[PDB]
């Protein structure tokens, strides 16, 4: 059944699993036409498919060409997501296929279940967790590869950089979710916190800065402060 606070440690066991987030698959700008009607213009999107244990991110870039001449795009976007996840599982050797796929939005369950009928042993699960994976497009290097794509493309990242050399996957996932939650709540403030000290850089093969353990504790504190402030503001509390 549903993944929640009570079965949280299951994410870090040795059963291969993937989170699928479809938030950034179908993205539009809304604009005025010359006649003063409103129209959308699609921009490139991405499926966010993440192994929470290894940090391996399968970023499937969704080029705007996939929407050309299609109707009901927000519905198609769920099915295109499920088609691409199914294709990814089939592309993986048997011993690398996930035993579970957790979808961050319940509207993905039927599309993914129907695309994965060939894999009756892969459990398709929803989650009670409010995971901030929608903020993936606030990571500069991920946003850059999506916006530059001229065709459909799969790009592989490790969203934890080299953190697993020093910390467990539980702690790595907590750091990731705190960073993404911050970027989702106040992107500008979050990014200022991450880059304010120009001496700490992002390696060419990394997504996040090369913080020492001590600097990560300070960064993690600044992100929690950002999140609580914005909460008091949001709710006048």
């Amino acid at each position: 059944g549903a993944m929640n606070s009570s079965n949280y440690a299951e994410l870090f066991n040795n059963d291969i699993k993937l989170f699928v987030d479809d938030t950034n698959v179908y993205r539009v700008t809304v604009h005025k036409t010359f006649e003063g009607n409103v129209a959308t213009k699609a921009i490139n999107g991405c499926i966010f498919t993440l192994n929470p244990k290894t940090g391996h991110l399968f970023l499937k870039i969704i080029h705007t060409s996939v929407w050309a001449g299609q109707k009901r795009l927000s519905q198609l976007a769920k099915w295109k997501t499920a088609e691409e996840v199914s294709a990814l599982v089939r592309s993986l050797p048997k011993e690398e296929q996930p035993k579970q796929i957790i979808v961050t939005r319940k509207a993905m369950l039927d599309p993914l279940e129907v695309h994965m009928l060939d894999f009756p042993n892969i459990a398709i699960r929803p989650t009670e967790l409010r995971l901030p994976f929608s903020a993936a497009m606030s990571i500069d290097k991920l946003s850059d590869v999506v916006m530059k794509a001229t065709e459909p493309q799969m790009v592989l990242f490790n969203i934890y950089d080299d953190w697993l050399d020093r910390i467990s996957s539980y702690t790595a996932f907590s750091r990731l979710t705190l960073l993404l939650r911050a970027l989702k709540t106040n992107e500008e403030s979050a990014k200022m916190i991450l880059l304010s000290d120009p001496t700490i850089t992002i390696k060419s093969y990394h997504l996040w800065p090369s913080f020492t353990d001590e600097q990560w504790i300070t960064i993690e504190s600044q992100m929690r402060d950002l999140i609580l402030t914005e909460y008091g503001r949001k709710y006048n509390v």
């Binding site: 519905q75 198609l76 099915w79 499920a82 088609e83 039927d110 599309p111 279940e113 129907v114 695309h115 009928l117 060939d118």
Partner: protein, 300 residues
């Protein structure tokens, strides 16, 4: 006009014959049911006064043999049996009629209800769903599970309804996942109608039988089967016009007949709301939508 004699009525019981029902008292001199219309299947059904659990009954067609009911004090039920000796049977029936110890099948001349509920139902199809080939009649009860229910345990006593599953390889063509899931026309027209049922008459016959088992025995698996077969048609964008018109008539008489007080347990809110208001066929079931809205507006 045909007769199902009873040897006796040793236990107090409510006896159903199709949509009609009679209370019989313990050891009442009751010797059966006469004037049963030839040309239709029939169901004789039972609910003991002392155990309003286990409704049970027999589907039969009087053209297929001479049937009678006899209480079995060991198995504790009214059993249907066939009398192979035609003369012994006519002699039994003539005596019971002369002594007027039989109730008359109480059909009103104007009333096509039973025909309308059983239009496509054939004994030969019932005997394939309810497997017991040594008998020409079919036993059904409240607790019998369907082949589909047994997958998700005794195969001998199962209802072998056609398995319908919207999230199955049977229902979904590789590379038409979204199309086949949102428009079930492929599944209805090629897999079910051409492939398994052969024609719409056999499909409607199973639908009608599932409804009647749901209504008369409160058989939950039958209720699931009836809803699935409705939903498969309503979820198909492409259905022959004759099938839609007939479906509207079938469902109209089923909704008309359902006891007002059982609407809550025999009608699936989600399926009916989807079928009448969201589905491709939302505007194709005029008679059914009018009777549902006037009789069960709560459900909707």
């Amino acid at each position: 006009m045909n007769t199902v004699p009873f040897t006796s009525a040793p236990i107090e019981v409510t006896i159903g014959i199709d949509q009609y029902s009679f209370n019989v008292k313990e050891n009442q001199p009751f010797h059966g049911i006469k004037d049963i219309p030839i040309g239709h299947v029939h169901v004789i059904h039972f609910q003991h006064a002392d155990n309003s659990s286990m409704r049970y009954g027999y589907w039969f067609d009087c053209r297929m043999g001479n049937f009678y009911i006899q209480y079995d004090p060991k198995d504790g039920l009214y059993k249907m049996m066939e009398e192979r000796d035609g003369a012994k049977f006519e002699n039994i029936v003539h005596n019971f009629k002369e002594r007027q110890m039989m109730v008359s099948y109480p059909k009103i001349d104007e009333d096509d209800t039973w025909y309308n509920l059983t239009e496509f139902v054939q004994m030969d199809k019932i005997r394939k769903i309810v497997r017991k080939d040594e008998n020409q009649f079919s036993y059904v009860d409240s607790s019998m599970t369907t082949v589909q229910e047994n997958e998700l345990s005794d195969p001998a006593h199962s209802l072998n309804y056609t398995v319908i599953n919207f999230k199955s390889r049977e229902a979904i063509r590789p590379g038409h996942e979204m199309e086949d899931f949102l428009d079930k026309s492929y599944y209805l027209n090629t897999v079910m109608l051409q492939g398994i049922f052969k024609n719409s008459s056999n499909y409607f016959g199973e639908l009608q039988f599932a409804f009647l088992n749901a209504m008369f025995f409160g058989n939950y698996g039958s209720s699931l089967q009836w809803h699935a077969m409705i939903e498969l048609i309503c979820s198909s964008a492409t259905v022959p016009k004759h099938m839609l018109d007939k479906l509207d008539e079938i469902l109209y008489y089923q909704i008309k007949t359902l006891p007002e007080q059982y609407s809550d347990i025999l009608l699936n809110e989600r399926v009916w709301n989807i079928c009448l208001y969201s589905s491709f066929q939302k505007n194709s079931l005029h008679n059914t939508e009018k009777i549902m809205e006037n009789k069960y507006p709560e459900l909707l």
